[PDB]
From a paper:
Signal transducer and activator of transcription (STAT) proteins communicate from cell-surface receptors to drive transcription of immune response genes. The parasite Toxoplasma gondii blocks STAT1-mediated gene expression by secreting the intrinsically disordered protein TgIST that traffics to the host nucleus, binds phosphorylated STAT1 dimers, and occupies nascent transcription sites that unexpectedly remain silenced. Cellular, biochemical, mutational, and structural data demonstrate that the repeat region of TgIST adopts a helical conformation upon binding to STAT1 dimers. TgIST binding to this newly exposed site at the STAT1 dimer interface alters its conformation and prevents the recruitment of co-transcriptional activators, thus defining the mechanism of blocked transcription.
Residue numbers in the entry:
A (entry chain A), B (entry chain A): 136 to 180, 192 to 415, 419 to 683, 700 to 714, 742 to 764
């Protein structure tokens, strides 16, 4: 399952190959020196020894031929490992970085990648040093068709182009733009709020500590700003530059954290646009440069596209765009919406929805909840291939409703985070359930039994219980749900308190709590025990329902008032 | 009732007197000129005419004697009016300015005072001009015992000293220091919050527009800072200066509003103090100077002492100190507490308490509410002479309680402002009533009847209803009060809603609302009508009391449960 094992070996092999080369060049100059030594002492005037100086010559030429073969052999294996490193392992990191940012499983450490990039780079610069001591031996001693001279140039050019792009691709945004004051929603930034972003260089060469300075550019190289209509122009406030180093990081990595960076719009002084503000993407790019003796390398990375918003109202709308982006696109195309947004497909939305909950809460969406939502978006066919347009997700109002899909679940999340967390996290809430299934689950259940479900018609995001009562005829019983509770109500008293002291009352009758067992036949106080709040007359504060027309209570008048309704509007 | 009528006349007389003087000096120089004219033409050589030039001489001397008498007569009436103006009318303004700032009736306009100060000052400078044209005539023509020369110096010195202190006393703080973000609580300022203060000069002389610049000094000339132990040292942030003018004001007055002034403490780098922070007073003083041709006047006014606090928690505690100050002291003594704070007396506290409500609300304390509070502080004797120590007001906890008096009423005010305003403002709340009177008012009342009273044991500040039920024996009925409601509860549902849907309930019994009539036999829904809030099952949210042991309801089991208590612990 790990191509890491083979990659470790290749770069091990790379390190192992440069080191023999270094060993063989030492004896190459060792013999180069005694050839000059012998050939010079013999010139200073039957023990021929000219047979030796002819052999010592051939060794030198063979040895030269050998290390030139060994270097090109190495440049050929390192071309193969970098292609893997840069074009597989690193590319896959970046995709699972955009999965992680929007709710996926956590990303691994950059450290395996950094370790790979590093010793490849460390080998790539030892070869540079070897190519240069070979040059020292070439002009101390050359001859016809010197294998040093015949490969000197393209060996030099091959190591650099490799080294150049290697560290060029090493320039990664380790942590994407993210307003700390809004931690769980990166890539969306509000004018006047500071955000942070951390760049990293994976090659980790001590020679580079405090030697690279990164500039931040907003909307660099914009054809879209003057092509697309009404594009908004912004500017970065803060230190636009920062120098990389290794002690600020705790892991010793070479990075440059732009803390305290903020964004404000231009003062151009309105126009219409085919792309609404949250649908409009920008990008934050970064530039640095490696000036060393004789060589110059230009580095340029870019963050994932960001959405900028005017006020916190636009936070959930914007985050839909982020999600649609990193769900589908893997490339920074700032026109991905335009008005060509791809429809997503349920097999992906299905679990990125599940992510929005496990990231916020400690519990994700289950299959039964996913079928519910599936049907709401697609229909009866719960097909993984199901195509979910972007308009049906955040633009057009869902089905026969007056609010879009995503915002309906954002505010459900809101509510769960702020009021329903331990209930939801313990799995007491069967919140995602159509009214059709809702009924069919309780139909053959004890009349004390209920279930908590989220309302599909509350824009502000509410929860409600549904219970079943018997209805003259044994089959086709009576199904009741209370008006669902928004945060306004649960701020005043928690849902577990509401459930326990709920009363159905009626003029001149005993109140009684309809709710007796939660769905799998579990007693109310045994189910919601741990979630309860727990000289004058004490007073408590409770939700109640007056029906307004054991012994006869108010649910006995509830039963009668609804059969009278059912016995009315009968056919004849 | 108005000494204004006589004052208007005196300063009218003052203006009327300078104007005849100006008329008489014109003919004084008119005749001075023809005396020189005749006496010179006669010198240029039986129609004596030396009889004329002897008479014209006597007129001049008499006229001179006359305007010197008329000026000293005026300087004598203006000494009398300024003493009134500066030492009565203005002093009384300043006392009713400190009454107004802390809840008294609104203060009048400075405009009558400004008009007085002005024409007195305008007269005082026309006299200066007259004293100077007299000087012009003196050296054109003098002689033995010239009445001009014999009074010239002290006339000059009398007009200036008068003019000097006149405008010196004209330097008033028109609007006291007051954090706008805390409007109803001036003289208390929090470090880092801007406050405003407006100085005014009442003399209103166009010559002075944009010609006076006022500096603000904090704690100027402090013997107390190094005498009293642990005194805190602060500093003003902002423009410390500002120039007076007349167009910034809308009434055309000469004033200098220090907007955007703020305060921060020193960085001396803890000690103990006999005076706690809110008990510690400071003062903000102001300096300006009148540099005109030949004369220099130094002006120095001071605001009422201010309390500085670290955070809004100290706002109600500090305001007690302000109140105790401007209730008793009329002079800016910054040690008024020290540990010699005077006891206030009920005849004053009584209505300054009533002020705290009519300033906040639209309704003050009534006699019945005042007797209540009187008794709580003093006792059975409701004497106006009653001495109320400062310790019993904000320092030591009231009676057998764990909280001080004043803060108990601040949080009642808080509650009324934030939850009970229209109830309180319509006089539906009999909130100030001991339990003893509370009972004795309902004893002979219908059993549906109740009354709303403030709890005397709620530090956070709560309201509750008390109703009466019949109790086997007709006399000595049953008195019930619910645990009183803090703001936590009334945020969730308003008190009028709580009252209407209040239910006493009990296991297997009908609920019923005990509350049927408010005290003067007024039906619940007819009393609290206007204050009510007014496909699932609807739900509402209501306060209830389970007694936990027409037809038999839950107040019938309430009645039985309390006689069983009363029938228990009986004597034998």
């Amino acid at each position: 399952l790990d191509k890491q094992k083979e990659l470790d070996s290749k770069v091990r092999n790379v390190k192992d190959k440069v080191m023999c080369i270094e060993h063989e060049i030492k004896s190459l100059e060792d013999l180069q020196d005694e050839y000059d030594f012998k050939c010079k002492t013999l010139q200073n005037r039957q023990k021929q020894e000219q047979l030796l100086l002819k052999k010592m010559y051939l060794m030198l030429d063979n040895k030269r031929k050998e290390v030139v073969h060994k270097i090109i052999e190495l440049l050929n294996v390192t071309e193969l490992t970098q292609n893997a490193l840069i074009n597989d392992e690193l590319v896959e990191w970046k995709r699972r970085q955009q999965s992680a940012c929007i709710g996926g499983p956590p990303n691994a450490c950059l450290d395996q990648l950094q370790n790979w990039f590093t010793i490849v780079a460390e080998s790539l610069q030892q070869v540079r040093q070897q190519l240069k001591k070979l040059e020292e031996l070439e002009q101390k001693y050359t001859y016809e068709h010197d294998p040093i001279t015949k490969n000197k140039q393209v060996l030099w050019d091959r190591t650099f182009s490799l080294f150049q792009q290697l560290i060029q691709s090493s320039f990664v945004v380790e942590r994407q733009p993210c307003m700390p004051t809004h931690p769980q929603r990166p890539l969306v930034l509000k004018t006047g709020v500071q955000f942070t972003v951390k760049l990293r260089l994976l090659v980790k060469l001590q020679e580079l500590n405090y030697n690279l300075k990164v500039k931040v550019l907003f909307d660099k190289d914009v054809n879209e700003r003057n092509t697309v209509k009404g594009f908004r122009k912004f500017n970065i406030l803060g230190t636009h530059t920062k120098v990389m180093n290794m002690e600020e990081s705790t892991n010793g990595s070479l990075a440059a954290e732009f803390r305290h960076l903020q964004l404000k719009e231009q003062k151009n002084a309105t126009n219409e646009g085919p792309l609404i503000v949250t649908e409009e993407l920008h990008s934050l790019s970064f530039e640095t440069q490696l000036c060393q003796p004789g060589l110059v390398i230009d580095l340029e990375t870019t963050s994932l596209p960001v959405v900028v918003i005017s006020n916190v109202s636009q936070l959930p709308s914007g985050w839909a765009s982020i999600l649609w982006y990193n769900m589908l696109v893997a490339e920074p195309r700032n026109l991905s919406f335009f008005l060509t947004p791809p429809c997503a497909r349920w097999a992906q939305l299905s679990e990125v929805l599940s992510w929005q909950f496990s990231s916020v809460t400690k519990r994700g969406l289950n299959v039964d909840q996913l079928n519910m939502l599936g049907e709401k978006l697609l229909g009866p066919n719960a097909s993984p291939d199901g195509l979910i347009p972007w308009t049906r997700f955040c633009k057009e109002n869902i089905n026969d409703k007056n609010f879009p899909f995503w915002l309906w679940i954002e505010s459900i999340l809101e509510l769960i985070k702020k009021h329903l967390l331990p209930l939801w996290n313990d799995g007491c809430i069967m919140g995602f359930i159509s009214k059709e299934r809702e009924r069919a689950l309780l139909k053959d259940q004890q009349p004390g039994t209920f279930l908590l479900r989220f309302s599909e018609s509350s824009r502000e995001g509410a929860i409600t219980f549904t219970w079943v009562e018997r209805s003259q005829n044994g089959g086709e019983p009576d199904f009741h749900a209370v008006e669902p509770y928004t945060k306004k109500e649960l701020s005043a008293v928690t849902f577990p308190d509401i459930i326990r002291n709920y009363k159905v009352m009626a003029a001149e009758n005993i109140p009684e709590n309809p709710l007796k067992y939660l769905y799998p036949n579990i007693d109310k106080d045994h189910a919601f025990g741990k979630y309860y709040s727990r000289g004058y007359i004490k007073t408590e504060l409770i939700s109640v329902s007056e029906v307004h027309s054991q012994v006869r209570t108010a649910l006995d008048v509830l039963r009668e008032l609804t059969q009278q309704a059912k016995q009315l509007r009968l056919t004849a």
